[PDB]
Amino acid sequence: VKINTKANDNSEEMRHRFRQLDSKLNDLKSLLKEIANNIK
Amino acid sequence: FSTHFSTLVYRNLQIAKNSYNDALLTFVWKLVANFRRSFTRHPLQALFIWAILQNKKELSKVIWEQTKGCTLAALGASKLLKTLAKVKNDINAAGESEELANEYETRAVELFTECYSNDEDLAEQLLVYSCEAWGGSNCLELAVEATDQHFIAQPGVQNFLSKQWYGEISRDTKNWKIILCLFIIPLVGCGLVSFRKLWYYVAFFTSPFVVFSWNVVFYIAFLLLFAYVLLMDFHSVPHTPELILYALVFVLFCDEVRQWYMNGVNYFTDLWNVMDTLGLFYFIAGIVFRLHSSNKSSLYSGRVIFCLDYIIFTLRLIHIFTVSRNLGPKIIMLQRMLIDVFFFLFLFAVWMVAFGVARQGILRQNEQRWRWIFRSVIYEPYLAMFGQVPSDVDSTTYDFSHCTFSGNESKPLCVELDEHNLPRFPEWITIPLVCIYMLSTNILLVNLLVAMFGYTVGIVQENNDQVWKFQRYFLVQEYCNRLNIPFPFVVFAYFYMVVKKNETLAWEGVMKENYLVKINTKANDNSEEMRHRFRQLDSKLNDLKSLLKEIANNIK
Amino acid sequence: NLGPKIIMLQRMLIDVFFFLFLFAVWMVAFGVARQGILRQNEQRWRWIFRSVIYEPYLAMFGQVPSDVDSTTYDFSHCTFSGNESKPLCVELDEHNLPRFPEWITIPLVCIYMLSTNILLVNLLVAMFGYTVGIVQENNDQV
Ligand SMILES: [Ca+2]
């Protein structure tokens, strides 16, 4: 467990957070497109 | 090569290559003249040389990368750059030339690592390959005549040279057991000793290693026998062992003469050969002296010269034995450290002269004898620095009342003429000066040198090993030039000789491609993809905003 | 804390071996050139070996032996006959004149003294130096 923690101590979670942010932005864009389609 | 080549560097290059002491420079000059005079072929070599000459590092690197003969091209380019860099006196051109030469040398060194690791046999085959019209010579032939000890110091090259020196002997046995196996005639009994990985019996003698061991045994035996002949027995008429000594020494002289004949130019430049040549030159004078007994004691004088040369032979004994595994490296650093010896000798000598000057101040008004003035001034402080201080003549022994005032008597030392039978020499300044000299020399200057020597070792100890490895090569090469032959049969063989006298490149290219891929991966390992990901995210956000604007426009 | 110092000597003995060899060759040369002064023929293994070994062996440590020829000049005490067991001798003087020339013998004494007493000895201290600090860290473990 200690070895795994040392390996994980890289602290690169910002990349995953950015990926999640991009996914959320894509979801928002898809929701906007769906709203536009529903309006039309 | 004529129009775009220009003349700024062409004139200097031609002038320097007219007499540059480099065969590669002569070949380059000939190629340049042919290109200008013209108005396998190896054209890409000429193109690469052109690229290198005007200090175009990126263009030269690309052209080299395109050329097939990457390793040899890089080696020779680095050699030529280092050779021609310093002819120009510019402080800017020299820096760029040195930087490019070092970059290319390290580039080739790092390239060869992957090739050696992937296939040792492929590397071994590649190194020994005559080039085509581009200064044809093997890899190590260029490397050794290029300095660049870093390339030859790499472990793979050292292992190759070790196996070459071993030759037809398989390295699977302890060194001591192999040494003992040299002395045993049959190899059948020594099953445990790894001779190989009567035919195989005769294969053993062909190893240069065994030849070198036999040579040192013979040389030490010769030294001992020659010393016995010189000192133990000497007569007006020479006798059997003396004649055999002449025979043996002429055998060695002939071997050295053959070595000189093989390489005349480097013989004079080489330092070690000079000492043995001088020793032989004095030895022939020794024979001349012993020829005719013109005077009753005229033979002892020549025996003196014989002995003086014997000293030089004793030194050559160490000279030849230089490289011996862990023993050899210690010898080299002494050559570099001799500067400290020189400086210490000078500094101590001046103090010696002053103390000798002040020793004679006690003595009589006028020595009037070069013999004793020189003898005393030199000899006395020379002991004091080592032991048994001489000032005991004046202080420790006070007055011994033994002086030969008359010049006829050859008696050491004297005392200044006593006044009214009273010893006039005053102690109150003479003895303190003795103490000052003792303190200055025995305990300060001596103990300085130890400290000095200290810094000389640790600072330069790391590099020393490399040099030793380099030196190792030379001996191998030498014993590779003479192959294997016993000394007495060696003389006869020399006389007889005097009477008589593709796929690897493709593999290297593939390895170079793999190495370039590795270099590209190392460059790309920066791991800066997050910037590109952020740029893509911004582009996606802009696209979403544009889509929203388009939807709004469609609604309106 | 006493024990660790012993081990490093075993590793450092290589320096002792190398120094012994290098000093021995110089010793042999100087012993060769010491006997050049002496009579044409020693004809006695006993004294030739005794002198050649023993003399430079002191010179390297102390009380240089060349005082037989230079410092003491000629003592006029030689047993030319082999029967007499007397140390040392002088080359047969020509017309009662000591034939041994100083102008080369004494300089050689000085060269040997410089080579051995102050250079080869003071080398070993330096050498030993690097042997310690480089390997001192590991020694404790052993
Ligand atoms: Ca030689």
Side-chain angles (χ1 to χ4, degrees), chain A residues 7 14 18 22 30 36, chain B residues 1 4-5 10 16 23 29 33 38 43 46-51 53-67 69-80 83-87 91 93-95 97 99-101 104 106-113 115-119 123 127-130 132-144 146 150-153 155-167 169-171 175-177 179-186 189-195 201-212 216-225 227-236 238 240-249 251-257 259-280 282-288 290 297-335 339-354 356-363 365-366 368-373 376-390 393 398 400-403 405-407 410 412 414-415 420 423 425-438 440-458 460-461 463 465-470 472-476 478-480 482-483 486 488 493 502 504-507 509 515-516 523 530 534 538 546 552, chain C residues 1-10 14-29 31-38 40-41 43-48 51-65 68 73 75-78 80-82 85 87 89-90 95 98 100-113 115-133 135-136 138 140-142:
Chain A
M14 299 296 86
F18 144 83
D22 282 10
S30 65
Chain B
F1 274 102
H4 300 85
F5 198 108
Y10 156 88
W29 199 102
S38 176
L47 174 51
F48 175 51
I49 294 160
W50 177 93
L53 284 185
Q54 294 88 3
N55 306 25
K56 301 175 177 300
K57 50 157 144 292
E58 297 296 347
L59 172 61
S60 65
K61 185 155 186 168
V62 173
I63 294 189
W64 156 92
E65 195 174 11
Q66 287 296 304
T67 55
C70 57
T71 177
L72 216 59
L75 275 173
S78 181
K79 200 279 178 59
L80 173 57
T83 303
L84 180 59
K86 192 63 193 66
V87 163
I91 299 295
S97 300
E99 164 54 21
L100 187 59
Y104 267 67
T106 59
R107 274 298 336 285
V109 174
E110 224 158 355
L111 150 59
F112 189 56
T113 67
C115 301
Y116 184 94
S117 182
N118 182 23
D119 188 329
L127 296 196
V128 175
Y129 167 82
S130 177
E132 42 184 4
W134 189 69
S137 287
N138 299 327
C139 169
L140 270 53
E141 291 180 351
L142 261 64
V144 179
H150 201 312
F151 171 69
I152 316 185
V157 171
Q158 175 176 330
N159 179 22
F160 159 81
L161 287 179
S162 176
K163 300 292 145 295
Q164 229 290 359
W165 187 33
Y166 274 55
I169 181 64
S170 180
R171 170 52 178 273
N175 184 13
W176 61 282
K177 278 207 172 299
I179 294 166
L180 272 50
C181 178
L182 163 50
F183 304 93
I184 183 174
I185 296 300
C190 298
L192 296 173
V193 178
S194 301
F195 163 85
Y201 160 86
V202 86
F204 190 82
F205 284 75
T206 68
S207 179
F209 189 106
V210 184
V211 174
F212 173 81
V216 295
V217 175
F218 149 73
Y219 196 72
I220 185 165
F222 167 91
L223 258 296
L224 195 161
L225 185 150
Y228 144 79
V229 170
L230 173 55
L231 199 294
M232 174 49 54
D233 297 329
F234 223 119
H235 305 76
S236 69
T240 36
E242 191 172 340
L243 314 175
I244 304 173
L245 182 61
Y246 301 128
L248 298 174
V249 71
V251 161
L252 163 56
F253 146 86
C254 182
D255 192 328
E256 274 290 1
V257 164
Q259 288 200 346
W260 161 89
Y261 184 95
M262 296 310 308
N263 191 335
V265 177
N266 279 246
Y267 177 95
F268 293 92
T269 64
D270 294 1
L271 292 66
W272 289 116
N273 289 338
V274 175
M275 284 186 173
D276 57 61
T277 301
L278 184 63
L280 274 41
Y282 279 105
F283 175 83
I284 73 93
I287 283 177
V288 170
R290 78 115 308 105
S297 284
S298 168
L299 203 169
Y300 168 96
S301 58
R303 294 172 51 268
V304 177
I305 307 305
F306 273 97
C307 173
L308 193 159
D309 311 355
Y310 216 89
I311 307 184
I312 298 167
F313 284 72
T314 57
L315 307 189
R316 172 153 192 182
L317 180 66
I318 271 56
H319 157 45
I320 65 97
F321 181 76
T322 43
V323 303
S324 180
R325 299 174 298 279
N326 61 327
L327 178 281
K330 312 308 188 180
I331 298 169
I332 292 295
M333 54 70 57
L334 174 59
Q335 179 176 353
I339 179 57
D340 299 355
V341 177
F342 174 93
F343 143 85
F344 169 87
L345 181 155
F346 178 94
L347 197 291
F348 160 82
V350 155
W351 283 79
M352 153 165 291
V353 171
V357 154
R359 179 89 156 80
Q360 313 304 341
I362 281 187
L363 177 63
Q365 304 163 18
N366 57 332
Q368 298 295 347
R369 186 164 44 261
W370 26 264
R371 172 69 188 276
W372 265 131
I373 185 170
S376 60
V377 162
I378 286 296
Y379 222 117
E380 305 301 323
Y382 208 104
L383 291 76
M385 80 92 175
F386 145 82
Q388 57 171 95
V389 67
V393 164
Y398 209 145
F400 190 28
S401 181
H402 280 97
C403 154
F405 301 94
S406 60
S410 181
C414 173
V415 294
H420 316 271
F425 76 114
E427 297 176 351
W428 73 288
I429 39 175
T430 58
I431 303 182
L433 172 55
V434 176
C435 299
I436 303 182
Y437 169 88
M438 287 287 295
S440 61
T441 48
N442 172 245
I443 47 178
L444 294 182
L445 262 46
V446 173
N447 301 333
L448 159 55
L449 181 42
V450 203
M452 163 53 62
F453 250 160
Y455 170 78
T456 297
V457 180
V460 317
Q461 184 55 94
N463 175 31
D465 54 61
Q466 162 173 223
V467 189
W468 170 78
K469 298 160 188 170
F470 200 115
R472 194 170 178 174
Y473 164 87
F474 275 109
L475 289 85
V476 176
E478 185 62 27
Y479 286 64
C480 190
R482 178 165 42 83
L483 291 68
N502 189 322
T504 51
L505 301 176
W507 180 95
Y515 156 88
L516 295 170
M530 299 297 86
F534 144 83
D538 282 10
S546 65
Chain C
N1 61 327
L2 178 281
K5 312 308 188 180
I6 298 169
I7 292 295
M8 54 70 57
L9 174 59
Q10 179 176 353
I14 179 57
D15 299 355
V16 177
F17 174 93
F18 143 85
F19 169 87
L20 181 155
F21 178 94
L22 197 291
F23 160 82
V25 155
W26 283 79
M27 153 165 291
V28 171
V32 154
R34 179 89 156 80
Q35 313 304 341
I37 281 187
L38 177 63
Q40 304 163 18
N41 57 332
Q43 298 295 347
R44 186 164 44 261
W45 26 264
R46 172 69 188 276
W47 265 131
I48 185 170
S51 60
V52 162
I53 286 296
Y54 222 117
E55 305 301 323
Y57 208 104
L58 291 76
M60 80 92 175
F61 145 82
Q63 57 171 95
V64 67
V68 164
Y73 209 145
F75 190 28
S76 181
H77 280 97
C78 154
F80 301 94
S81 60
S85 181
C89 173
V90 294
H95 316 271
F100 76 114
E102 297 176 351
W103 73 288
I104 39 175
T105 58
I106 303 182
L108 172 55
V109 176
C110 299
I111 303 182
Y112 169 88
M113 287 287 296
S115 61
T116 48
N117 173 245
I118 47 178
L119 294 182
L120 262 46
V121 173
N122 301 333
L123 159 55
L124 181 42
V125 203
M127 163 53 62
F128 250 160
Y130 170 78
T131 297
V132 180
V135 317
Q136 184 55 94
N138 175 31
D140 54 61
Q141 162 173 223
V142 189

